[PDB]
Design a protein around this ligand. Sequence first.
Ligand SMILES: *C[C@H](NC(=O)OCc1ccccc1)C(=O)O
Lengths: 212, 4
Amino acid sequence: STLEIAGLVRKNLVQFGVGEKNGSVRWVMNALGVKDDWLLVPSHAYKFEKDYEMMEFYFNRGGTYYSISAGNVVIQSLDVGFQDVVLMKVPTIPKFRDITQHFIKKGDVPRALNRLATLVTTVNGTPMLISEGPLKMEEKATYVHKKNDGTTVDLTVDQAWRGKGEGLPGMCGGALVSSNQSIQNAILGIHVAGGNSILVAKLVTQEMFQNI
Amino acid sequence: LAAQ
Ligand SMILES: *C[C@H](NC(=O)OCc1ccccc1)C(=O)O
């Protein structure tokens, strides 16, 4: 069911934060553990700020905190080009339950279209289920990221789900879960943007995990 | 759309 997939997502969601060495942590969004010490996280969380590699990354797993130099996480792309969401290996994180087999197969994408879905996410650790209206797939999606200083960047990704719904700051990194029980309520991807009552998630397929 |  949607709710049981949601429980598996919930248990693998951590809070992602960034800070300078010896400084306060800025808690930005969610990251989703997928297998071993690998997580999915929107790279817009960190990549557009100055000297990101000299920062410390923080992972909050239910009130237990894990930190690491940004230079010591291994970042792997989902596909060619910029997809925002990346795979990130964090050596200091406790091993995750392998949830990769719960993600949609590329070939099954059409089966999630025109059906409801649920965004399974948090706002700074408080779990939320956000209803999304019948889904469409945009071959290219563009959204605006506001950086810490106030300036903005336009981001464009390939293959992003679009659904009617109401989101809040901090919900990025949560997982979109299909209502379609015939594909075992597959995880469809990772929430990256929202506005004007529309929610956008980058497609993440099972096949993408072959990038190790 | 804004990055959330
Ligand atoms: C949610 C996970 N399920 C899983 O990996 O399913 C693989 C499977 C299940 C049944 C028959 C064939 C393959 C889990 O934690 O097990």
